[PDB]
Short mmCIF file of all heavy atoms in Angstrom, two decimals:
data_model
loop_
_atom_site.label_atom_id
_atom_site.label_comp_id
_atom_site.label_asym_id
_atom_site.label_seq_id
_atom_site.Cartn_x
_atom_site.Cartn_y
_atom_site.Cartn_z
N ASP A 230 -15.51 25.79 17.96
CA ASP A 230 -16.46 26.74 17.65
C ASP A 230 -16.57 27.97 18.68
O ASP A 230 -17.06 27.80 19.78
CB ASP A 230 -17.89 26.03 17.65
CG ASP A 230 -18.99 26.96 17.19
OD1 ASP A 230 -18.76 28.14 17.07
OD2 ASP A 230 -20.17 26.42 16.96
N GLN A 231 -15.98 29.16 18.19
CA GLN A 231 -15.85 30.21 19.12
C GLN A 231 -17.27 30.86 19.55
O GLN A 231 -17.28 31.70 20.47
CB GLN A 231 -14.82 31.33 18.60
CG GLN A 231 -15.29 31.89 17.31
CD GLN A 231 -14.63 31.11 16.10
OE1 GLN A 231 -14.32 30.03 16.30
NE2 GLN A 231 -14.59 31.82 14.90
N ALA A 232 -18.28 30.44 18.90
CA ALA A 232 -19.63 30.88 19.42
C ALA A 232 -20.02 30.28 20.70
O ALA A 232 -20.89 30.86 21.38
CB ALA A 232 -20.65 30.54 18.34
N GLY A 233 -19.38 29.15 21.07
CA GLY A 233 -19.75 28.41 22.29
C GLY A 233 -18.62 28.17 23.23
O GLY A 233 -18.78 28.11 24.40
N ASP A 234 -17.44 28.11 22.76
CA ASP A 234 -16.16 27.74 23.45
C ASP A 234 -15.08 28.84 23.46
O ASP A 234 -14.92 29.49 22.29
CB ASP A 234 -15.53 26.46 22.86
CG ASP A 234 -16.49 25.19 23.07
OD1 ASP A 234 -17.27 25.15 23.95
OD2 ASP A 234 -16.50 24.30 22.23
N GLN A 235 -14.42 28.90 24.42
CA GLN A 235 -13.30 29.82 24.52
C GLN A 235 -12.09 28.88 25.07
O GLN A 235 -12.20 28.35 26.11
CB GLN A 235 -13.56 30.97 25.43
CG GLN A 235 -12.20 31.80 25.83
CD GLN A 235 -11.38 32.38 24.58
OE1 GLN A 235 -11.75 32.06 23.43
NE2 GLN A 235 -10.40 33.21 24.90
N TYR A 236 -10.88 28.91 24.31
CA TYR A 236 -9.82 28.19 24.81
C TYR A 236 -8.96 29.08 25.93
O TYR A 236 -8.75 30.21 25.69
CB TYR A 236 -8.86 27.87 23.69
CG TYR A 236 -7.54 27.32 24.09
CD1 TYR A 236 -7.38 26.13 24.87
CD2 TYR A 236 -6.32 27.88 23.57
CE1 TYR A 236 -6.09 25.68 25.26
CE2 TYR A 236 -5.06 27.39 24.00
CZ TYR A 236 -4.93 26.36 24.73
OH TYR A 236 -3.76 25.81 25.13
N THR A 237 -8.68 28.36 27.12
CA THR A 237 -8.21 29.17 28.16
C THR A 237 -6.62 29.47 28.02
O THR A 237 -6.19 30.25 28.82
CB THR A 237 -8.33 28.43 29.55
OG1 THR A 237 -7.63 27.23 29.44
CG2 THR A 237 -9.77 28.26 29.85
N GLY A 238 -6.07 28.86 27.06
CA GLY A 238 -4.63 29.00 26.94
C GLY A 238 -3.82 27.92 27.74
O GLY A 238 -2.61 27.95 27.80
N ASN A 239 -4.56 27.08 28.44
CA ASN A 239 -3.95 25.91 29.21
C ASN A 239 -4.18 24.61 28.58
O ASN A 239 -5.33 24.34 28.18
CB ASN A 239 -4.47 25.98 30.56
CG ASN A 239 -4.06 27.29 31.40
OD1 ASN A 239 -2.94 27.63 31.49
ND2 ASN A 239 -5.13 27.92 31.86
N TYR A 240 -3.20 23.79 28.51
CA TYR A 240 -3.28 22.35 27.99
C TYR A 240 -2.27 21.51 28.59
O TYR A 240 -1.28 22.00 29.13
CB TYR A 240 -3.13 22.40 26.45
CG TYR A 240 -1.79 22.62 25.99
CD1 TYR A 240 -0.89 21.38 25.71
CD2 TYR A 240 -1.18 23.83 25.75
CE1 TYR A 240 0.37 21.60 25.32
CE2 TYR A 240 0.09 24.01 25.27
CZ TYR A 240 0.88 22.77 25.05
OH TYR A 240 2.14 22.98 24.63
N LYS A 241 -2.46 20.18 28.55
CA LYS A 241 -1.46 19.24 28.83
C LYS A 241 -1.42 18.23 27.86
O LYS A 241 -2.50 17.95 27.30
CB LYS A 241 -1.63 18.71 30.20
CG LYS A 241 -1.51 19.70 31.45
CD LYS A 241 -1.61 19.05 32.76
CE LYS A 241 -1.82 20.19 33.86
NZ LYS A 241 -2.37 19.68 35.16
N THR A 242 -0.31 17.56 27.69
CA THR A 242 -0.08 16.53 26.72
C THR A 242 0.55 15.34 27.46
O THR A 242 1.42 15.61 28.20
CB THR A 242 0.71 16.97 25.53
OG1 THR A 242 0.03 17.95 24.77
CG2 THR A 242 1.00 15.76 24.55
N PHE A 243 0.08 14.09 27.25
CA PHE A 243 0.46 12.92 27.92
C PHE A 243 0.80 11.85 26.95
O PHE A 243 0.12 11.72 25.83
CB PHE A 243 -0.61 12.34 28.92
CG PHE A 243 -0.99 13.34 29.93
CD1 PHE A 243 -2.06 14.24 29.72
CD2 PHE A 243 -0.34 13.49 31.13
CE1 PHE A 243 -2.46 15.14 30.61
CE2 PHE A 243 -0.74 14.38 32.02
CZ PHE A 243 -1.76 15.30 31.88
N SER A 244 1.80 10.98 27.23
CA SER A 244 1.98 9.85 26.42
C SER A 244 0.82 8.77 26.68
O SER A 244 0.27 8.64 27.77
CB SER A 244 3.28 9.07 26.78
OG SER A 244 3.27 8.72 28.10
N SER A 245 0.31 8.18 25.59
CA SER A 245 -0.83 7.30 25.72
C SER A 245 -0.39 5.85 25.90
O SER A 245 -1.23 4.95 26.27
CB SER A 245 -1.74 7.34 24.32
OG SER A 245 -2.21 8.60 24.12
N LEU A 246 0.98 5.56 25.74
CA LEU A 246 1.55 4.28 25.83
C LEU A 246 2.99 4.31 26.26
O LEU A 246 3.50 5.54 26.27
CB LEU A 246 1.63 3.65 24.36
CG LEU A 246 0.37 3.46 23.49
CD1 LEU A 246 0.82 3.07 22.09
CD2 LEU A 246 -0.52 2.54 24.12
N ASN A 247 3.59 3.25 26.64
CA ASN A 247 5.07 3.25 26.85
C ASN A 247 5.76 3.56 25.63
O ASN A 247 5.49 2.89 24.56
CB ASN A 247 5.52 1.90 27.49
CG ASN A 247 4.79 1.44 28.75
OD1 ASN A 247 4.44 2.44 29.62
ND2 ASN A 247 4.46 0.23 28.90
N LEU A 248 6.67 4.51 25.63
CA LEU A 248 7.62 4.90 24.49
C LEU A 248 8.97 4.43 24.74
O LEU A 248 9.63 4.71 25.78
CB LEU A 248 7.46 6.43 24.27
CG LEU A 248 6.08 6.93 24.37
CD1 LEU A 248 6.15 8.43 24.25
CD2 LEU A 248 5.31 6.34 23.16
N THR A 249 9.58 3.80 23.74
CA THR A 249 11.00 3.40 23.88
C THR A 249 11.81 4.32 22.99
O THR A 249 11.43 4.57 21.81
CB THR A 249 11.26 1.91 23.46
OG1 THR A 249 10.52 0.99 24.17
CG2 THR A 249 12.80 1.73 23.69
N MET A 250 12.83 4.93 23.58
CA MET A 250 13.63 6.03 23.01
C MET A 250 14.83 5.32 22.26
O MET A 250 15.07 4.18 22.56
CB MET A 250 14.10 7.01 23.94
CG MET A 250 12.98 7.48 24.91
SD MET A 250 11.52 8.06 24.07
CE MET A 250 12.14 9.61 23.44
N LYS A 251 15.37 5.97 21.27
CA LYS A 251 16.54 5.42 20.55
C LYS A 251 17.80 4.90 21.45
O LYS A 251 18.42 3.97 21.09
CB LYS A 251 17.17 6.30 19.51
CG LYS A 251 16.14 6.52 18.31
CD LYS A 251 16.77 7.60 17.34
CE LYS A 251 16.06 7.55 15.98
NZ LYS A 251 14.61 7.90 16.03
N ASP A 252 17.86 5.55 22.63
CA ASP A 252 18.95 5.13 23.44
C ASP A 252 18.77 3.93 24.35
O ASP A 252 19.61 3.36 24.89
CB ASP A 252 19.55 6.31 24.23
CG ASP A 252 18.41 6.75 25.19
OD1 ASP A 252 17.38 6.22 25.39
OD2 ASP A 252 18.73 7.94 25.79
N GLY A 253 17.36 3.51 24.32
CA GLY A 253 16.95 2.38 25.14
C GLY A 253 16.19 2.73 26.44
O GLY A 253 15.62 1.86 26.98
N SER A 254 16.14 4.02 26.74
CA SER A 254 15.36 4.54 27.85
C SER A 254 13.81 4.35 27.51
O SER A 254 13.46 4.27 26.34
CB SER A 254 15.67 5.92 28.26
OG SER A 254 15.36 6.87 27.21
N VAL A 255 12.97 4.36 28.45
CA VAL A 255 11.54 4.36 28.24
C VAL A 255 10.74 5.37 29.02
O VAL A 255 11.06 5.61 30.19
CB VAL A 255 11.01 2.87 28.70
CG1 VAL A 255 9.62 2.78 28.70
CG2 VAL A 255 11.69 1.86 27.86
N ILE A 256 9.79 6.02 28.29
CA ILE A 256 8.80 6.92 28.94
C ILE A 256 7.55 6.16 29.11
O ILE A 256 6.93 5.75 28.19
CB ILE A 256 8.71 8.12 27.98
CG1 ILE A 256 10.03 8.89 27.83
CG2 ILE A 256 7.58 9.06 28.54
CD1 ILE A 256 9.83 10.15 26.99
N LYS A 257 7.08 6.02 30.40
CA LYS A 257 5.97 5.28 30.62
C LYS A 257 4.65 5.94 30.25
O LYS A 257 4.56 7.12 30.10
CB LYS A 257 5.77 4.75 32.03
CG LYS A 257 5.67 5.80 33.07
CD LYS A 257 5.70 5.23 34.52
CE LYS A 257 5.37 6.35 35.56
NZ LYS A 257 5.86 5.99 36.91
N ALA A 258 3.67 5.06 29.85
CA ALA A 258 2.34 5.64 29.56
C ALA A 258 1.82 6.52 30.64
O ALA A 258 2.07 6.22 31.88
CB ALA A 258 1.38 4.37 29.37
N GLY A 259 1.19 7.64 30.35
CA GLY A 259 0.72 8.62 31.25
C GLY A 259 1.65 9.75 31.67
O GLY A 259 1.30 10.60 32.36
N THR A 260 2.87 9.60 31.08
CA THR A 260 3.81 10.68 31.37
C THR A 260 3.45 12.07 30.79
O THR A 260 3.02 12.09 29.59
CB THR A 260 5.20 10.40 30.93
OG1 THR A 260 5.62 9.18 31.58
CG2 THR A 260 6.15 11.51 31.32
N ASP A 261 3.52 13.07 31.54
CA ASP A 261 3.28 14.41 31.13
C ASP A 261 4.34 14.88 30.13
O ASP A 261 5.52 15.02 30.55
CB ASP A 261 3.04 15.49 32.31
CG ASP A 261 2.69 16.72 31.84
OD1 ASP A 261 3.06 17.26 30.77
OD2 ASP A 261 1.94 17.54 32.60
N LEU A 262 4.05 15.02 28.87
CA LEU A 262 4.98 15.49 27.83
C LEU A 262 4.74 16.86 27.34
O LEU A 262 5.25 17.31 26.32
CB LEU A 262 4.91 14.54 26.56
CG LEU A 262 5.32 13.01 26.75
CD1 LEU A 262 5.01 12.23 25.54
CD2 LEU A 262 6.71 12.97 27.28
N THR A 263 4.01 17.68 28.17
CA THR A 263 3.68 18.99 27.76
C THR A 263 4.92 19.81 27.46
O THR A 263 4.95 20.70 26.52
CB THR A 263 2.92 19.73 28.77
OG1 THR A 263 1.75 18.88 29.15
CG2 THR A 263 2.38 21.03 28.36
N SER A 264 6.12 19.66 28.20
CA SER A 264 7.26 20.35 27.94
C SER A 264 7.96 19.99 26.67
O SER A 264 8.98 20.60 26.20
CB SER A 264 8.18 20.16 29.08
OG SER A 264 8.71 18.85 29.14
N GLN A 265 7.51 18.90 26.00
CA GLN A 265 8.06 18.44 24.72
C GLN A 265 7.11 19.04 23.60
O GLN A 265 7.30 18.42 22.47
CB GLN A 265 8.16 16.92 24.60
CG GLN A 265 9.05 16.38 25.84
CD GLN A 265 10.51 16.69 25.69
OE1 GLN A 265 10.86 17.47 24.72
NE2 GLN A 265 11.31 16.27 26.66
N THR A 266 6.25 19.86 23.89
CA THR A 266 5.30 20.42 22.84
C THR A 266 5.41 21.93 22.81
O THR A 266 5.86 22.50 23.85
CB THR A 266 3.84 19.95 23.08
OG1 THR A 266 3.38 20.67 24.29
CG2 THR A 266 3.68 18.60 23.19
N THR A 267 4.87 22.48 21.68
CA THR A 267 4.71 23.94 21.71
C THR A 267 3.30 24.18 21.29
O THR A 267 2.65 23.35 20.64
CB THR A 267 5.59 24.70 20.77
OG1 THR A 267 5.17 24.22 19.39
CG2 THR A 267 7.06 24.35 20.99
N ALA A 268 2.64 25.28 21.47
CA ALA A 268 1.28 25.54 21.07
C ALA A 268 1.19 26.98 20.39
O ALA A 268 1.97 27.88 20.76
CB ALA A 268 0.33 25.47 22.35
N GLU A 269 0.40 26.97 19.40
CA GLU A 269 0.08 28.18 18.66
C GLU A 269 -1.37 28.40 18.58
O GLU A 269 -2.15 27.56 18.46
CB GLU A 269 0.65 28.05 17.20
CG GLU A 269 0.35 29.19 16.26
CD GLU A 269 0.99 29.15 14.98
OE1 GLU A 269 1.75 28.18 14.73
OE2 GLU A 269 0.92 30.07 14.16
N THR A 270 -1.78 29.58 18.89
CA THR A 270 -3.24 29.89 19.04
C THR A 270 -3.62 31.11 18.30
O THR A 270 -2.99 32.06 18.13
CB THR A 270 -3.50 30.21 20.60
OG1 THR A 270 -3.02 29.12 21.43
CG2 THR A 270 -5.02 30.20 20.79
N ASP A 271 -4.69 30.89 17.57
CA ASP A 271 -5.36 31.95 16.73
C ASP A 271 -6.58 32.45 17.39
O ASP A 271 -7.70 31.79 17.25
CB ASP A 271 -5.53 31.45 15.26
CG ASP A 271 -6.13 32.39 14.40
OD1 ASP A 271 -6.68 33.52 14.80
OD2 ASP A 271 -6.23 32.17 13.22
N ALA A 272 -6.49 33.56 17.94
CA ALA A 272 -7.52 34.16 18.73
C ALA A 272 -8.71 34.68 17.82
O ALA A 272 -9.88 34.53 18.21
CB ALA A 272 -7.02 35.36 19.51
N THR A 273 -8.38 35.11 16.69
CA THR A 273 -9.33 35.59 15.81
C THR A 273 -10.34 34.45 15.46
O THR A 273 -11.62 34.61 15.57
CB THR A 273 -8.83 36.08 14.50
OG1 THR A 273 -8.13 37.37 14.72
CG2 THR A 273 -10.01 36.57 13.60
N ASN A 274 -9.81 33.39 14.91
CA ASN A 274 -10.56 32.30 14.39
C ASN A 274 -10.85 31.16 15.34
O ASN A 274 -11.53 30.26 14.92
CB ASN A 274 -9.93 31.78 13.13
CG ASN A 274 -9.79 32.72 12.07
OD1 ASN A 274 -10.72 33.11 11.45
ND2 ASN A 274 -8.49 33.34 11.76
N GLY A 275 -10.41 31.16 16.60
CA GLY A 275 -10.62 30.17 17.46
C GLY A 275 -9.97 28.84 17.08
O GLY A 275 -10.62 27.86 16.78
N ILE A 276 -8.64 28.88 17.03
CA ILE A 276 -7.97 27.65 16.56
C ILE A 276 -6.74 27.44 17.52
O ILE A 276 -6.03 28.46 17.81
CB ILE A 276 -7.39 27.70 15.18
CG1 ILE A 276 -8.55 28.03 14.16
CG2 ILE A 276 -6.86 26.26 14.78
CD1 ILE A 276 -8.13 28.23 12.74
N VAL A 277 -6.46 26.34 18.03
CA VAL A 277 -5.23 26.13 18.81
C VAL A 277 -4.61 24.87 18.17
O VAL A 277 -5.13 23.92 17.79
CB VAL A 277 -5.56 25.88 20.28
CG1 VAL A 277 -6.68 24.97 20.64
CG2 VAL A 277 -4.22 25.54 20.95
N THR A 278 -3.24 25.00 18.01
CA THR A 278 -2.47 23.94 17.47
C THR A 278 -1.36 23.58 18.43
O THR A 278 -0.54 24.43 18.70
CB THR A 278 -1.82 24.32 16.10
OG1 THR A 278 -2.89 24.56 15.05
CG2 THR A 278 -0.85 23.17 15.61
N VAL A 279 -1.38 22.36 18.80
CA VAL A 279 -0.29 21.82 19.69
C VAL A 279 0.59 20.93 18.98
O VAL A 279 0.18 20.00 18.29
CB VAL A 279 -0.96 21.04 20.97
CG1 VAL A 279 0.23 20.47 21.74
CG2 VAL A 279 -1.68 22.06 21.79
N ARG A 280 1.95 21.17 18.89
CA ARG A 280 2.86 20.45 18.23
C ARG A 280 3.87 19.80 19.08
O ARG A 280 4.38 20.41 19.93
CB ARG A 280 3.61 21.19 17.17
CG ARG A 280 2.69 22.22 16.30
CD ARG A 280 3.50 22.85 15.08
NE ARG A 280 2.69 23.52 14.18
CZ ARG A 280 1.81 23.11 13.25
NH1 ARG A 280 1.69 21.88 13.03
NH2 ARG A 280 1.16 24.01 12.50
N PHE A 281 4.31 18.57 18.84
CA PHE A 281 5.54 18.01 19.39
C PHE A 281 6.75 18.62 18.76
O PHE A 281 6.74 18.95 17.55
CB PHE A 281 5.57 16.43 19.21
CG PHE A 281 4.84 15.66 20.32
CD1 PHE A 281 3.60 15.22 20.15
CD2 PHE A 281 5.57 15.45 21.48
CE1 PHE A 281 2.88 14.67 21.17
CE2 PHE A 281 4.83 14.84 22.52
CZ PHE A 281 3.52 14.39 22.38
N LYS A 282 7.78 18.96 19.70
CA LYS A 282 9.01 19.44 19.29
C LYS A 282 9.70 18.46 18.37
O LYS A 282 9.75 17.24 18.68
CB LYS A 282 9.87 19.79 20.45
CG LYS A 282 9.29 20.98 21.21
CD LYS A 282 10.10 21.11 22.47
CE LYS A 282 9.56 22.26 23.35
NZ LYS A 282 10.34 22.40 24.69
N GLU A 283 10.35 18.88 17.32
CA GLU A 283 10.95 17.93 16.33
C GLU A 283 11.97 17.13 16.96
O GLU A 283 12.15 15.89 16.78
CB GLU A 283 11.44 18.66 15.13
CG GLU A 283 11.98 17.76 13.95
CD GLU A 283 12.37 18.52 12.64
OE1 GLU A 283 11.68 19.57 12.39
OE2 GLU A 283 13.35 18.21 12.04
N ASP A 284 12.79 17.80 17.84
CA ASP A 284 13.95 17.15 18.50
C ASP A 284 13.53 16.08 19.49
O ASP A 284 14.16 15.13 19.70
CB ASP A 284 14.80 18.26 19.21
CG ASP A 284 15.72 19.01 18.23
OD1 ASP A 284 15.67 18.76 17.01
OD2 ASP A 284 16.41 19.93 18.81
N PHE A 285 12.27 16.20 20.02
CA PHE A 285 11.74 15.11 20.79
C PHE A 285 11.37 13.95 20.06
O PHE A 285 11.60 12.77 20.40
CB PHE A 285 10.53 15.66 21.74
CG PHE A 285 9.91 14.52 22.50
CD1 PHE A 285 10.52 14.02 23.66
CD2 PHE A 285 8.71 13.89 22.08
CE1 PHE A 285 9.97 13.06 24.33
CE2 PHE A 285 8.17 12.85 22.73
CZ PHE A 285 8.77 12.42 23.97
N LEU A 286 10.59 14.23 18.95
CA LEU A 286 10.11 13.15 18.10
C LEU A 286 11.39 12.38 17.54
O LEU A 286 11.25 11.09 17.41
CB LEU A 286 9.33 13.69 17.00
CG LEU A 286 8.01 14.18 17.36
CD1 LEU A 286 7.32 14.84 16.16
CD2 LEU A 286 6.96 13.25 18.06
N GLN A 287 12.44 13.02 17.28
CA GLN A 287 13.67 12.44 16.82
C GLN A 287 14.21 11.37 17.78
O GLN A 287 14.98 10.38 17.35
CB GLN A 287 14.83 13.46 16.51
CG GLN A 287 16.08 12.80 16.00
CD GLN A 287 16.00 12.22 14.66
OE1 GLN A 287 14.98 12.55 13.86
NE2 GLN A 287 16.85 11.26 14.29
N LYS A 288 13.94 11.57 19.07
CA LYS A 288 14.43 10.63 20.17
C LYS A 288 13.66 9.35 20.14
O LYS A 288 14.18 8.38 20.78
CB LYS A 288 14.52 11.29 21.47
CG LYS A 288 15.39 12.44 21.59
CD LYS A 288 15.03 13.27 22.96
CE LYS A 288 15.71 14.53 23.08
NZ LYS A 288 15.61 15.20 24.42
N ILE A 289 12.45 9.14 19.41
CA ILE A 289 11.62 8.02 19.56
C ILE A 289 12.19 6.91 18.76
O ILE A 289 12.44 7.11 17.58
CB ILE A 289 10.16 8.26 19.12
CG1 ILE A 289 9.59 9.31 20.10
CG2 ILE A 289 9.30 7.02 19.14
CD1 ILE A 289 8.29 9.93 19.46
N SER A 290 12.36 5.67 19.24
CA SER A 290 12.82 4.63 18.34
C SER A 290 11.88 4.29 17.23
O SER A 290 10.71 4.41 17.40
CB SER A 290 13.00 3.33 19.26
OG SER A 290 13.49 2.40 18.34
N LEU A 291 12.48 3.95 16.04
CA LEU A 291 11.58 3.48 14.98
C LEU A 291 10.89 2.29 15.41
O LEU A 291 9.84 1.88 14.82
CB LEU A 291 12.40 3.25 13.68
CG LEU A 291 13.05 4.45 13.00
CD1 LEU A 291 13.79 3.97 11.85
CD2 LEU A 291 11.97 5.43 12.57
N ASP A 292 11.41 1.44 16.32
CA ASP A 292 10.75 0.27 16.77
C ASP A 292 9.67 0.47 17.79
O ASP A 292 8.98 -0.48 18.07
CB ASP A 292 11.72 -0.82 17.35
CG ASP A 292 12.94 -0.94 16.63
OD1 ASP A 292 12.94 -0.93 15.37
OD2 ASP A 292 14.01 -1.00 17.27
N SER A 293 9.51 1.72 18.30
CA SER A 293 8.59 1.99 19.43
C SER A 293 7.29 2.36 18.75
O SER A 293 7.17 3.03 17.71
CB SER A 293 9.18 3.14 20.24
OG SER A 293 8.19 3.41 21.29
N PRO A 294 6.14 1.97 19.51
CA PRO A 294 4.81 2.64 18.95
C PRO A 294 4.92 4.07 19.48
O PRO A 294 5.83 4.44 20.31
CB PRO A 294 3.87 1.91 19.90
CG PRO A 294 4.63 1.47 21.08
CD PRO A 294 6.00 1.03 20.55
N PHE A 295 4.09 4.96 18.94
CA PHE A 295 3.92 6.28 19.47
C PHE A 295 2.54 6.67 19.46
O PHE A 295 1.83 6.61 18.54
CB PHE A 295 4.84 7.29 18.71
CG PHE A 295 4.74 8.65 19.22
CD1 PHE A 295 5.52 9.07 20.31
CD2 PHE A 295 3.87 9.60 18.71
CE1 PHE A 295 5.54 10.37 20.87
CE2 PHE A 295 3.78 10.89 19.20
CZ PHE A 295 4.72 11.22 20.26
N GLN A 296 2.08 7.17 20.59
CA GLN A 296 0.69 7.81 20.66
C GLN A 296 0.71 8.70 21.87
O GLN A 296 1.26 8.48 22.93
CB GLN A 296 -0.34 6.72 20.88
CG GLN A 296 -1.75 7.20 20.77
CD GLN A 296 -2.78 6.12 20.98
OE1 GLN A 296 -2.50 5.13 21.65
NE2 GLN A 296 -3.85 6.14 20.31
N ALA A 297 0.02 9.86 21.73
CA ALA A 297 0.02 10.91 22.83
C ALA A 297 -1.43 11.54 22.67
O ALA A 297 -2.12 11.44 21.64
CB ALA A 297 1.05 11.93 22.58
#
Side-chain angles (χ1 to χ4, degrees):
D230 184 354
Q231 59 268 21
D234 291 333
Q235 168 59 354
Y236 173 54
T237 61
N239 295 304
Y240 75 95
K241 292 184 197 162
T242 297
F243 303 91
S244 58
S245 298
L246 306 175
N247 303 327
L248 309 177
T249 306
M250 312 309 285
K251 287 178 163 64
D252 63 10
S254 65
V255 171
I256 296 182
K257 65 189 187 197
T260 303
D261 181 327
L262 293 176
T263 309
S264 69
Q265 305 291 1
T266 68
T267 68
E269 173 176 4
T270 309
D271 176 353
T273 296
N274 297 289
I276 308 178
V277 49
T278 296
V279 171
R280 313 191 177 280
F281 272 95
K282 289 174 185 179
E283 185 176 323
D284 284 359
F285 174 76
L286 293 174
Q287 178 65 24
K288 298 164 188 189
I289 302 165
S290 179
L291 296 175
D292 315 317
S293 180
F295 182 83
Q296 184 180 36

